[PDB]
Amino acid sequence: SMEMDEKDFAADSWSLAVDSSFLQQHKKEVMKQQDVIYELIQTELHHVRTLKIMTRLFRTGMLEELHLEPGVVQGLFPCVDELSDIHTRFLSQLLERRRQALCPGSTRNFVIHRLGDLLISQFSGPSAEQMCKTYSEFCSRHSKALKLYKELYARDKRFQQFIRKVTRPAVLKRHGVQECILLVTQRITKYPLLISRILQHSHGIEEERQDLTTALGLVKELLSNVDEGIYQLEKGARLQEIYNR
């Protein structure tokens, strides 16, 4: 995560991020709406940061420091570049909407009134097709990735030293390999909870209430398609086990 974005999302809430004199200018319902939108953006920033630990710290470190067999790093981190591209582009659009909303002379005072249209765009068309294709593949390789990591940690001395070395700093406490994989799997199921609470405080403008209602339905359609396209792959499983599923 870059320092500019970390500072902008350091506070526990939007009401604590903005200047107290700017906060005083808004009605209670707007503060509640903005606190939830800030939580959605701040958790997306953390999610993108989790994907960078997987690609730059873990994946790239194993390629440049260790001698693993071909297709082992891919098996440990399936679809990480594709996932990183989906969410870095979505994070870019969310931060650009916050930036345009900033008051002249300020780097922290803003109000986002039109989130719905951005969410409809992310969860429809080609970008929803790519999210569905990517999560359906990643989630189906989840258990194979975990079993491969355990085998490597238990049988390879140089891999174990590598993991112990890169996960030693306190900032990596919640971000070991397996923890990163579950953090990503769990991300998509957080969107309906956040969108629904934003919708609860967005009745002020009818068009916004309608756009978030459409966005919530598109997110649930996506999750249902992903859930239905999941089958855990198993290394060494025979065809007979598969067609007798």
């Binding site: 526990d12 809430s13 989630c139 919640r174 923890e179 579950l182 769990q186 909870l193 992903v226 859930d227």
Partner: protein, 179 residues
């Protein structure tokens, strides 16, 4: 410090997300209560043993039967939650959540936790439930359900007041350390 993994299960209305938040901050939030919990690694010392307990939520996974079990691998202790202001959440424990947890987490200890115990003597709660011919869950009804499902133990807490929250997680750590 050994590493252990905890996962909390239960209906969306059981208050599992709030319980994980109040424990991880040692405070019920005064400005903003977060909608979601990502993960947390708590440093806990129980009975002289130091443990790093990784905390996970399942909120948002309830309608997705193929995504939800992905939270279960290598779990060391299950917190199975229900709300004391919701007898319907307790009804869902023995034939929905218990068979699933026993299938994906065999031999993992389960702690049945009655959340929102502060609402047992709340007048608005008693009036609302009476309309549907119901009442807040009694302490003995929780103990009997825990006994029935083969739980390691039965505990109660209130995330609003913090009462019993520390005890739940220290007992979960003890359960995670057993053979």
């Amino acid at each position: 410090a050994i590493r252990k993994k905890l996962v909390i299960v239960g209906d969306g209305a059981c208050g599992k997300t709030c319980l994980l938040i109040v424990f991880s901050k040692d405070q019920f939030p005064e400005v903003y209560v977060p909608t979601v919990f990502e993960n947390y690694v708590a440093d806990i010392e129980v009975d002289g043993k130091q443990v790093e307990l990784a905390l996970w939520d399942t909120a948002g996974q309830e309608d997705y039967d193929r995504l939800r079990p992905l939270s279960y691998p290598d779990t060391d202790v299950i917190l199975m939650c229900f709300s004391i202001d919701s007898p319907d959440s307790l009804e869902n424990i023995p034939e929905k959540w218990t068979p699933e947890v026993k299938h994906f987490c065999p031999n993992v200890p389960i702690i049945l936790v009655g959340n929102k115990k502060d609402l047992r003597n709340d007048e608005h709660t008693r009036r609302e439930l009476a309309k549907m011919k119901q009442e807040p869950v009694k302490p003995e009804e929780g103990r009997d359900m825990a006994n029935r499902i083969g739980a390691f133990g039965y505990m109660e807490c209130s995330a609003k007041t913090k009462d019993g929250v520390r005890e739940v997680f220290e007992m979960a750590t003890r359960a995670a350390l057993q053979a």
